[PDB]
Amino acid sequence: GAMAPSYRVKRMDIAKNDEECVVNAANPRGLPGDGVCKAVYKKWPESFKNSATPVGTAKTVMCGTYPVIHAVGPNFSNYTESEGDRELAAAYREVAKEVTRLGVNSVAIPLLSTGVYSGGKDRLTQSLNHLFTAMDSTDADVVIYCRDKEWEKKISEAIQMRT
Numbered sequence: 001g002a003m004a005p006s007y008r009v010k011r012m013d014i015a016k017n018d019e020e021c022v023v024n025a026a027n028p029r030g031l032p033g034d035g036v037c038k039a040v041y042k043k044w045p046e047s048f049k050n051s052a053t054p055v056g057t058a059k060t061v062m063c064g065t066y067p068v069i070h071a072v073g074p075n076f077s078n079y080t081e082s083e084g085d086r087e088l089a090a091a092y093r094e095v096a097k098e099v100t101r102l103g104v105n106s107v108a109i110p111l112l113s114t115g116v117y118s119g120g121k122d123r124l125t126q127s128l129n130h131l132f133t134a135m136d137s138t139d140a141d142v143v144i145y146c147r148d149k150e151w152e153k154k155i156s157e158a159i160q161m162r163t
């Protein structure tokens, strides 16, 4: 475990993370995809061997000794708000199980279902709150990655609010 488990946020490419493992915002078919998933494919392509997994699950594949946790959030274009919310919460619960099983002291994680799977809605708060629900009981240092300057400020504020 980390000596004083923390949350932090950084605005940069998650493929340049300084953590002991990474969470990919994967598609269910283990395809290279776009956004976070394409960056992850370019950096760790060996981790896409048999990485296909259903919505609401996470599947870990090693790139050398570096773990890539493929977490599949729902595409809110296809799911109802209700069913999508349940699957987005479940994906993060499976991430916490994998992070625990791997024994890592730190994890880089993107906000699942906030990009092309968002169904055109701002889901910062929804996705971040499901992240916290899952990861609060783990003792890994969590570093959240994003692209947008306004999102960095809002994620930082939400972390600081809990102290």
Ligand SMILES: COCc1cc(C(N)=O)no1
Pocket: 012, 013, 014, 015, 034, 035, 036, 037, 039, 040, 115, 145, 146, 147, 148
């Ligand atoms: C905010 O989604 C766009 C995005 C983020 C990234 C990344 N590499 O973290 N690539 O595309």
Ligand SMILES: [Cl-]
Pocket: 011, 012, 013, 016
């Ligand atoms: Cl960058």
Ligand SMILES: [Cl-]
Pocket: 025, 112, 113, 114, 115, 116, 117, 118
């Ligand atoms: Cl997304």
Ligand SMILES: [Cl-]
Pocket: 146, 147, 148, 151
């Ligand atoms: Cl972002």
